[PDB]
Structures are given as C-alpha cells and as structure tokens.
C-alpha cells in the first residue's frame, strides 16, 4: 500500500467540503453521476475509431447500490477507466487550477452546489462520506484501490478484489447522520431531481 500527500489545495478543498456548513448535500449524486457520465462519453469516443476498446464490455451504463448492512453508497460506471498516473494525480482531474478557480467563484457570491463547474465535483463525495475507496481499471493497466477518509492523505494499492473488467466504482462510507442517502425512495427523488437527463441508463439496485 502506497500513501501520498494531497497536494495543498487540494487538502484546503477537502476541508472546506468537510466543515462547512451547507444543507443542501443531496448535490453530491449528481455530481458523481456527471463523471461516471464523462467517463462513459470519453470510452465511447475512443471505440468510434477503435472498436476493440470494447473488449473489456460493451455495456455502457451506471449502477446505483445502496448497501445498508455497510453503509454504503456505491456509485458504478463502465466508463474509461483511470490509471494509476490518473488515480495519483487527483483522479484524472486538474484539481490544483480547478480548486484555485472554484475558491475565486465562492469568494465572488458562488455556492458549494457549483462545484462541478470546476472540475472537482468528485470531492463532493466528503459532503456525506467519512472515507471514499474507488476501484478502477483502465484498459491500459490494471486493476486499483484508491482511498481516503481525508485528513491530508490517500492510499493507492493493486486491487485483488473482484475484476472490474472496465470503469470506476466509487464507494461511500457515509457519515452516521447521513444514511438518507441509502433509502430507494430518497435516491429516486434526487436522480429525478438533477440527473433526469443523463445519457446512459442508471439502475438503481434494491436490498
Ligand atoms: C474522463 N473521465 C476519465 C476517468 N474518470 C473516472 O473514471 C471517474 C468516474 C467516476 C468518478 O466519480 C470519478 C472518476 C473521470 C473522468
């Protein structure tokens, strides 16, 4: 297991998620549910040219899966994919110049809900989770964990866990006052609410 430093900025937007306060958490759903969604647009444009990316599954889709016993919420795609380079550099986001602007727009009147304009809505995961473990698999390399209950630092491992095939599960342990967020009919509301138009199929399991 490798443990790295978050970069500054990005340690500054972890804890600024962390405590502030801010009511309206629900945004972080459709903030994960847009990545999944460009994750799954960038495999697709990549098997236009290049149908053999498609390999590892055709399928492209998001699956909601409430899971009460763990309290979790996972979040899975059939998406690109990160690698480890990706993982390690803030999730395959410009997180560092993303942080710097969405600092700039809150100062200016913004609210944590815009988020996403900035390309760091991932870290709106920390609006209801303790700690995040995501597991992904590109085509060009194999199968990670990256994980982190914030405080400054995450870890990044091979993955011997169950085969992906292709994608990005992002897994919420979610805070102990915040386990709305496994209830179907909550779910629902807020897929229906900020994700009505997303263009691939979400199935939102049961228990
Ligand atoms: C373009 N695309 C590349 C890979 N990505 C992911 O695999 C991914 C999927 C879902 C997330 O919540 C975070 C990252 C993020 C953005």
Redesign the pocket.
Known sequence: VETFAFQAEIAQLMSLIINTFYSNKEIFLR??????S??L??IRYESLTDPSKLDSGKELHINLIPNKQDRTLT?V?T????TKA?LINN???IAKSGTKAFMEALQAGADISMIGQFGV??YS?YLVAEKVT?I?K?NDDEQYAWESSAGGSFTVRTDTGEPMGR??K?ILHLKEDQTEYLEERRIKEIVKKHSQFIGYPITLFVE
């Open positions: 903030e994960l549910i847009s990545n999944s460009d994750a647009d960038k979040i795609d998406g690109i994919g990160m990706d999730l395959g986001t809505g991932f995961a995501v992904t590109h994608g990005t992002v």
